[PDB]
Amino acid sequence: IDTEKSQQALVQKRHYLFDVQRNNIAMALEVTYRERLYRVYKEVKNRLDYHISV
């Protein structure tokens, strides 16, 4: 009986794998978005200050 109950508790906690998949996907796409932001920002400022420096 107690083994059955423990199995029930584990299979209750089951959903963490799926929500971790969720978290990883969300974080990955957010990181990519902010990386694009900084890519374009950095490079246009690079062109601008290239002109300034020359």
């Binding site: 009986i1 959903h15 963490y16 990955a28 932001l37």
Partner: protein
């Protein structure tokens, strides 16, 4: 960016033994994304033209460059992945809901059996037939041993 609360070895209790590497690989990737988002801020620090208009000697190049900047659409990434894992999770919820239902049937089946074994008449009243009914392992095999004593003489 909304995130979900997470315990970690609570996530390892539920992971089967066929995909441990996959599991803690996703764990490592999670940590990579933790530190990486924690590092850089949300938005880039916008830039002032006064330092860029009073400096560049080119004709309006500051203004049109930064106009293209302030008139630029950066491609927002799209999920295309949370829905499928959400549906997978729903399906698994179904599967293990029915698993636990079956095992609840088994719970109270076991508890019925335990109430039976708890309601056994004292042994000094029990006949060999009743002991056999309450411990069916003691039933002498009248097929592999059809003749008295109905068991191997070593156990006899």
């Amino acid at each position: 960016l909304a995130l979900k609360t997470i315990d970690w070895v609570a996530f390892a209790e539920i992971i089967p033994q066929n995909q441990k590497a996959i599991a803690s690989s996703l764990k490592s990737w999670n940590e990579t994304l933790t530190s990486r988002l924690a590092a850089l801020p949300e938005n880039p620090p916008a830039i002032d033209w006064a330092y860029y208009k009073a400096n560049v000697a080119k004709a309006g190049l500051v203004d049109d460059f930064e106009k293209k900047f302030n008139a630029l659409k950066v491609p927002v990434p799209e999920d295309k992945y949370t829905a499928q894992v959400d549906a997978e999770e729903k399906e698994d919820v179904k599967s293990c809901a029915e698993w636990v239902s079956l095992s609840k049937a088994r719970i109270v089946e076991y508890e019925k059996e335990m109430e039976k074994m708890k309601n056994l008449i004292p042994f000094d009243q029990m006949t060999i037939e009743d002991l056999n009914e309450a411990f069916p392992e003691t039933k002498l095999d009248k097929k592999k041993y059809p003749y008295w004593p109905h068991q191997p003489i070593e156990n006899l």
